[PDB]
Amino acid sequence: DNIQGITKPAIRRLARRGGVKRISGLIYEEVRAVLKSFLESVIRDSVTYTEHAKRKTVTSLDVVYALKRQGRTLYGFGG
Amino acid sequence: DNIQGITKPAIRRLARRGGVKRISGLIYEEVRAVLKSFLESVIRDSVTYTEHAKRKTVTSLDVVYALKRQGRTLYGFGG
Amino acid sequence: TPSELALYEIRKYQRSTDLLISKIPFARLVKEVTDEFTTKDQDLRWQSMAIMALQEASEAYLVGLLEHTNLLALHAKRITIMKKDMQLARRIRGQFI
Amino acid sequence: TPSELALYEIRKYQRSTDLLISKIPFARLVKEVTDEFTTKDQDLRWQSMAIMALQEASEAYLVGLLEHTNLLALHAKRITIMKKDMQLARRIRGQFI
Amino acid sequence: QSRSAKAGLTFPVGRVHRLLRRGNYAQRIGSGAPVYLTAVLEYLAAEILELAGNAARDNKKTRIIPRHLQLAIRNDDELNKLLGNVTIAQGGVLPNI
Amino acid sequence: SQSRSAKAGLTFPVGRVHRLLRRGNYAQRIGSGAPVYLTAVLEYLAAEILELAGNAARDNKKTRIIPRHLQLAIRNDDELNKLLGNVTIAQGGVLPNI
Amino acid sequence: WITPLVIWQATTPVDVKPWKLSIIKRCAMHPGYRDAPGSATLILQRFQCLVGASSQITESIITINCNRKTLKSHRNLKLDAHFLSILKRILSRAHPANFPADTVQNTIDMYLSEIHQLGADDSTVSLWDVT
Amino acid sequence: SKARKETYSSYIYKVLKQTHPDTGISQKSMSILNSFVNDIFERIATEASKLAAYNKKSTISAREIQTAVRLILPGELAKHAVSEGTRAVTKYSSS
Amino acid sequence: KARKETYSSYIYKVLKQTHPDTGISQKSMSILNSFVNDIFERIATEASKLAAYNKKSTISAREIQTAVRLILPGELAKHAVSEGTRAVTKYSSSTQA
């Protein structure tokens, strides 16, 4: 599975960019779960936006607006 | 003057409502400081609303409007 | 035992719904704070229902902060809420900061 | 010493600005997730700049969560981020929960 | 015979129509929007009132209180997440167990 | 005839802002002095951020301004970090911390 | 009463003199005071923030430390509100546009807050560096 | 002498009596319910207006309102809400 | 040959006055456009909300000044209001003369 495709070195890299030194073995699954939940929310919002737009293709505009719905505004796209 | 006027039994009742069973000494004036900060943050926008309205009294509508602007919506006070 | 009385009053404040901070001192506090923000030409005016609204929001925020500090205390293996725990709660929730 | 190499690569990732998760697997992940949400009549369509946008927001959120977990770890006197610490960070920030 | 009487909605329809027109939300308003919004509002109000009433049944009191309203809202996890940012006046806090 | 952008001494446009406010469906009527005030404040904010980004680039001694520089300036300035606490910048990275 | 005072006028590493440290520490070490260990702890803490780390001053405090409820009460300085309220009015009346009442109360408060913080905690100047 | 207060009080009371007549309402609960209804209506209306303005749609219709309520209300309540709303609109059109 | 409204050349000219030479990437230009659009939208929404609150059909210089004072922290807000006041006074005086 490609959710398992997220490799352990990637999660180690992420936690270290956060600023950790030692990482336990139970962190990777929780990181995958939280990423899955955030993705589920953003995708559901983007999909309902594009379903209203009666288009079979989503757009960076719709992704930005899902992000603005979540309150995490993203810059450098759309406009 | 009245910052110490907020008496420590009130903070004790707040701590008991929160659910703790042990109390230190620093938390007293830390609660006083955080209350002062929250009060100033709300009061600034409440006074801004009142002054813009050209009225020279502060009302429940103005304070709940300031709270909703902050994001901590308050119910049961009308408007 | 102190724990018995402590837990009894925890029960009563868990099913209590009254204000815990003195009304006249709180009114004076907000009174003098909003006079501090004011120019010398005028003085502001305030209303009782506004005072209750501000107090109610204030203790909603305070109860949230204090229960989060209690959770941090449980994390730190200490039943005592302390200075570093309160600092950490304030930082992590990070409102108007 | 392991600490020397660890700190060197911490330096390089502190002044690094590239994506850290593989592009094709991430694209497949979002691909299959959004097909999972779909009815059987159609299939959705996606675009590369949208993929970068979603990935960028995802790792912004992830870096925030991980640095908060590191702060909790410092609070708990342990240099190791662990299950309870991550649970606590997720709860306290409490987004879409 | 009122439009609300035909619609079967307790909440009025022309009221919502005039509110939508007054609020300049759009340059031109529709006709099914007021009835749809009124129906949604009535459903939500009936749901919250019924849950508060059930909380009252469990409270064996003929008078319902903001205490019971907070009980219903916070006990329903979905409603709590929908209304996470609001604070109920004189609502109290939930018992630990 | 010179433009009232030139009357206001503002590089940012006033007519475009006025049209956007008229067609933005914000209020029933738009004030005459509203667009000039809005253009002035927008230009002041943009100029301040551009000055900060240019200072950051000069400190970094590259003539090109990058999202990394923009994020660095925004996160280093408290008055801007307060206004932009939640928004994230694409390809901005994280401010280096000890 | 002079213990809160001594905290105030001495704000420099120079005023933190070892002969002054010996006198303050010995009084706390002296048995017949009943208040020097409470008084010396704040003075030593005030002297700590002035000179820096001062590993010599933390070894003296831990020897003279108390249950620190009284130290919390000793950290707080109780000044009469009625005394200061009249003083603010008196100062403003005598000297207009001098010693404002708001700052007079504020100046006392930060002097009081300094005591509270103890528990938690031709000479050549170049015109080139003048900013 | 006083401009009438625009509330939903009579309709909320009627809904409660339709459900069950034994109990009553307190004034604070009444204000809480009024504020909640007003907030929900404002949220939905603002969302519909913003969504219509996005697709340069000059008008607001049932489709836009349904999409807005799907955006705001979580799916569990949204299913029942859209079902009942569609029922109401279709029966109103029939009438 | 249809022109799309975007504050690109104007920000380029502002940078030209700021420094004799300074390059900006396309991503940086898009970020600046998004930021200015966000700020304009926030201020316009605040002004419209204030007008709706005060039962006023129109917004004006005072309305926008109050709105921007609300949005910005006071330190930048005083600079912004000084900007607006001197700009509007000099614009009105030029028309009269």
Author numbering:
A (entry chain b), B (entry chain f): 25 to 103
C (entry chain e), D (entry chain a): 133 to 229
E (entry chain c): 17 to 113
F (entry chain g): 16 to 113
G (entry chain II): 148 to 268, 285 to 294
H (entry chain d): 34 to 128
I (entry chain h): 35 to 131
Question: What wording appears in the published article?
Answer:
The point centromere of budding yeast specifies assembly of the large kinetochore complex to mediate chromatid segregation. Kinetochores comprise the centromere-associated inner kinetochore (CCAN) complex and the microtubule-binding outer kinetochore KNL1-MIS12-NDC80 (KMN) network. The inner kinetochore centromere-associated inner kinetochore (CCAN) complex (14 to 16 subunits) associates with the centromere, generally through specific recognition of CENP-ANuc.
We determined the cryo–electron microscopy structure of the yeast inner kinetochore assembled onto the centromere-specific centromere protein A nucleosomes (CENP-ANuc). The two unwrapped DNA duplexes create binding sites for two asymmetrically arranged CCAN protomers, termed CCANTopo and CCANNon-topo, which bind CENP-ANuc through two different binding modes. These two modes of CCAN binding to centromeric DNA differ in the position of the CENP-HIKHead-TW module, constituting topological and nontopological DNA binding mechanisms (CCANTopo and CCANNon-topo). A second CCAN assembles onto the 3′ end of the DNA using a nontopological DNA binding mode identical to our previous CCAN:W601-CENP-ANuc structure, generating an asymmetric, dimeric CCAN inner kinetochore. Specifically, the C terminus of CENP-I of CCANNon-topo forms contacts with the CEP3A subunit of CBF3Core, which are unique to CCANNon-topo and not a feature of the CCANTopo:CBF3 interaction. In the inner kinetochore complex, CBF3Core adopts the same architecture as seen for free CBF3Core, except that the Gal4-DNA binding domain of the CEP3A subunit shifts position to interact with the essential CCG motif of CDEIII, similar to the complex of CBF3Core with CEN3-CENP-ANuc. In our structure, the CENP-ANuc core is flanked on both sides by a CCAN protomer that engage the unwrapped ends of the nucleosome in an asymmetric arrangement, bridged by CBF3Core. This assembly comprises two copies of all CCAN and histone subunits and of the Cep3 subunit of CBF3Core, a stoichiometry that is in agreement with in vivo fluorescence microscopy–based assessments of the relative proportions of yeast inner kinetochore subunits, which are mainly found at approximately two to three copies per kinetochore.
